């Protein structure tokens, strides 16, 4: 099995990423990252596969003005694979889930990082291409 | 209030070779030889003939308290080389059986499955002490030796190695406990 190795963190708090699911939300505004113990003055940051707390700044009214967990599926900041290759996506994206990691939506638009798929089997089930 | 003279005496058996010099007592018997250093006692040891006499002169009540302690220790040495000491322990468990593995010529024991834990508890017997699993009784250990302190201390090491933690010990009574303090 094993746990996921560290990745470059490219999405600090206040980062606004695209919503890659069909829940009706168009973007996700990151307000915190789970598992961050932190450092003075250091902004919490997330990478692909990290669960974050976010708010929908643009989307269906039923999803706005609310705090919900989400999972990052793509990021623009390059990160190093163990085989020495640096990867990155064209944009930053995430999907809304519940505290147990179950997707709120039912479909995912675009590819998702392999790191996120391994940690979240529910997200991988609804994914199209896992890279 | 210092009493002028406090003295106590004990009888030395016929088949014991007791040697005393400068509060260094050596006892030899059929089972072996035992020696204890009593230089920390401010007493006067004397063999009169066989009997052992211990005197305290102008000693406070605390000082005279060591007179009986010295005799009891000497008596234990005599019994150690004549009859020996046998401490029996019993495994106590509710659900998980306690598995014991004797090894190294009965000079070591390993406890496994204590409350289902995967950690292996290893205890090494002290000098002159041998541990053997009893066959007549179910889940019983037998520790034998000449020195009561070493045999009794070996049993204590086993008992304290199997303490339950983070639980109500009143209900979780699992452990290894001394059931009999006797002699061979």
């Amino acid at each position: 099995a094993g746990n996921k190795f560290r990745m470059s963190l490219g999405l600090p708090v206040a980062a606004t990423v695209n919503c890659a699911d069909n829940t009706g939300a168009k973007n996700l505004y990151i307000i915190s990252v789970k598992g961050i113990k932190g450092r003075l003055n250091r902004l919490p940051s997330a990478c692909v596969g990290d669960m974050v707390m976010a708010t929908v700044k643009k989307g269906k009214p039923d999803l706005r003005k609310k705090v919900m967990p989400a999972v990052i599926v793509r990021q623009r900041k390059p990160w190093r694979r163990k085989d020495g290759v640096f990867m990155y996506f064209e944009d930053n994206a995430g999907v809304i889930v519940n505290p147990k990691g179950e997707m709120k939506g039912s479909a995912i638009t675009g590819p998702i990082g392999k790191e996120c798929a391994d940690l979240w089997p529910r997200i991988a089930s609804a994914a199209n291409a896992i890279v | 209030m210092k009493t002028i003279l406090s003295s106590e005496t004990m009888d030395i058996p016929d088949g014991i070779t007791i040697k005393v010099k400068a509060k260094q007592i050596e006892v030899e018997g059929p089972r072996g030889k035992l020696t204890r250093n009593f230089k920390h006692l401010n007493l006067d040891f004397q063999l009169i003939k066989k009997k052992l006499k211990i005197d305290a002169w102008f000693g406070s009540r605390k000082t005279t308290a060591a007179i009986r302690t010295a005799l009891s220790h000497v008596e234990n040495l005599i019994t150690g080389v004549t009859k020996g000491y046998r401490y029996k322990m019993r495994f106590v468990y509710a659900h998980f059986p306690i598995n014991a593995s004797i090894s190294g010529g009965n000079k070591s024991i390993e406890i496994r499955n204590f409350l289902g834990e995967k950690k292996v508890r290893k205890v090494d017997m002290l000098d002159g002490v041998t541990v053997v699993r009893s066959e007549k009784v179910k889940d019983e250990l037998v520790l034998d030796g000449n020195d009561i302190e070493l045999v009794s201390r070996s049993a204590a090491l086993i008992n304290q190695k199997c303490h339950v933690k983070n639980k109500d010990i009143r209900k979780f009574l699992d452990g290894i406990y001394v059931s009999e303090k006797g002699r061979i």
Partner: protein, 52 residues
């Protein structure tokens, strides 16, 4: 399940005790004074409570 004889032996070490009301030290059942120096060898002792 534990045999009645064995559980009586176990409770000799874990249940039959006196507890100091000042320092909570475990004392032998016939104790009259606590052996601890922090409480001043207090004589205020209580039995160790049983399971109901």
């Amino acid at each position: 399940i534990i045999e009645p004889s064995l559980m009586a032996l176990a409770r000799k070490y874990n249940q039959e005790k006196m507890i100091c009301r000042k320092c909570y030290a475990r004392l032998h059942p016939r104790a009259v004074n606590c052996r601890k120096r922090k409480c001043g060898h207090s004589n205020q002792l209580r039995p160790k409570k049983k399971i109901k």
